[PDB]
Amino acid sequence: PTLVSALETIEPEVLYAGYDSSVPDSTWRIMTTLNMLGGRQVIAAVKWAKAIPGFRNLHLDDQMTLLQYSWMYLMAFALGWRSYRQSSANLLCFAPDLIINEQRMTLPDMYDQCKHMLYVSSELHRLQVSYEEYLCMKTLLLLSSVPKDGLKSQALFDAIRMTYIKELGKAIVKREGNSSQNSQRFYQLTKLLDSMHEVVENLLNYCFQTFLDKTMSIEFPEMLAEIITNQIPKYSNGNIKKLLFHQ
C-alpha cells in the first residue's frame, strides 16, 4: 500500500463536542466544552503521531519533543481543514456539533484569535487543497520544529522529513500536471506551512499557563498527554530551530 493511503487510514474519526444547541447560548458553556474537546484532541494527536511511518523509528526523547513543540500546529491545521470542508472558511468548525460564527465572538481579544484560526481555513480555501495534500502537509507540521542543539536521531529525522516532502510533491502531481504549475503550487503550500509558526505563536501566547526554557524529557504517551493538557506548555523560541522552507 502507498504511503498516502497509510496516512489516510491512521487519520482518526472526527470528535464530537457533546454540546446542546437547543438551549440558549452560554459563552461559559462553549469555553468549558472547548477545553474538554481540546484535551481529547491531544490524546488523538499523540495516538496519531505514534502511528506515522518513520516516527516510531526515532528515539523516544525525539518523539516526545516533536509532539511538545507541534501539538497546537496539528490541532489548528485540522481545525482549518474542517472549517474549509464544511463552511468554506466562514465558520470555525471545532466539531460537527460546535460550529462558532465569527460575529458571535464580538470581544476584540477573542475575535483577533478567531481571525488567526480562520486564516488557516481561508488559505486552504484559496489554494483549493486536496485531502492527500492536507495529509502530507499535516505530517510535515509534526516535523516543523527542532531543538537548537539538535535531536539524538537527527540524520533519520532529516530522511523522514524529506520523504514526506517528496510525498507532498506526489500529491501535487495528481491534480493536473505541468512542471511550472507544480513548482508554483509547492511554493504556495510550503509558504502556508511557514506561516503556521506565526499563527501558533499567537494561539499559544493566548492560552499558555506555563513557560519552559527547554523541552521536558518524557518517555510515555500517557504522561505526555497529561503534561500538555494540564499546564499548556509554551517552550522558549531561543532554543527552537523553527524549520522554514523560505527565509
Added chain:
Amino acid sequence: PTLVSALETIEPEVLYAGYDSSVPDSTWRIMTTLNMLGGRQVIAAVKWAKAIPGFRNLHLDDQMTLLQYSWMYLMAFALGWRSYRQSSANLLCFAPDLIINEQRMTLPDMYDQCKHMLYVSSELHRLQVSYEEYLCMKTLLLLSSVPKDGLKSQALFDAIRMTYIKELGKAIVKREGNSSQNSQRFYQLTKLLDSMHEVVENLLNYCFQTFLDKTMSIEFPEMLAEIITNQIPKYSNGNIKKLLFHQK
C-alpha cells in the same frame, strides 16, 4: 463566645486567582482561571457549611441536600460582598487578583450575567450592609431552599433557621436603634435574600451541565464537592420549596 463571632472565625481566608494582570488580556485565560477558582470555592463552601452551628446536628441526607441547592447562592452572595467592599459595586471582584470590569465583558450573554452578579453588590452597597449582617444573611442562604415533601430533621431545621433570623435582628440593633428603623431594615435585608432566588436561577441556567429532578442522596458525604464541581447540578423547581420571607 457569641454566635456571630463563631460565624466570624469559621469565615475562610479570601482565595487568590493566581492570574497575571501585567500581560495583555486573554478571555480564554480569565475563564480558565475562573473555573479553577469556582472549584476551590465549592471546597471552601462545604467546609464552611459543616462548621456552621446547628448544621452538623441535622441528618446527613438533609446536610447534603441543603448544600446541593444552596452552593451558587453562597458563592454569588460572597462575590457581591467582595465586589462591594473592594470596588463599591462597579467591578466584579472574583478574587483580589481577578477583578473584571463590566465594560470588558462586551458580549450580551456574558454582560447579562455580570449585571445579575452586580445587582447583589449594588444592593449591599445601597443598604450599607454590616459585616455581621452579611455573615447572618449568608448563613440564611444555606437554609433558603427545602425539598417539597420535606426534610428528615425538619423541626430542628426550623429552629436552626429561626435562631439565625434572630441573630440577623441582633446584628441590625448594633447599627443605631429605633424599633421602626430596625423593622424596616429587617424588611429590606429579607427582600434582598428573597431576590437571590431569581439571581441564582439565572446564573445556574447559564452554567449548569446536568439537570436532575430530585436531590442526589450521596453515600460518602466527602464526595459532595467533587459531585457539584464535575457536573454543576441544577435541581428542578417543582420539587423545591424556595423559602421566602414575603410571597409574590
